[PDB]
């Protein structure tokens, strides 16, 4: 017995990259609303 980290690299990299692209698009859209303020 006693046979022994899923943090970033053994953690999944698909949906984490999806969240990164999502916050990228959110930052672009919020700066676009900041520039074009009616």
């Amino acid at each position: 017995k006693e046979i022994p980290d899923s943090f970033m690299q053994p953690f999944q990299s698909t949906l984490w990259l999806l969240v990164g692209l999502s916050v990228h698009v959110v930052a672009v859209m919020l700066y676009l609303l900041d520039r074009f303020s009616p």
């Binding site: 053994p10 953690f11 698909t14 999806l18």
Partner: protein, 43 residues
Amino acid sequence: EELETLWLTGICHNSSQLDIDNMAGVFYMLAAAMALSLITFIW
């Protein structure tokens, strides 16, 4: 029951990629964000 315990005996029973249903909620919150952004943008 003793003979079935002697012969027919098993074990009683009941991941980082388990968020296959959370991402649907991510998509719904993204759609709600886009809808409310259009509401704030038209006025």
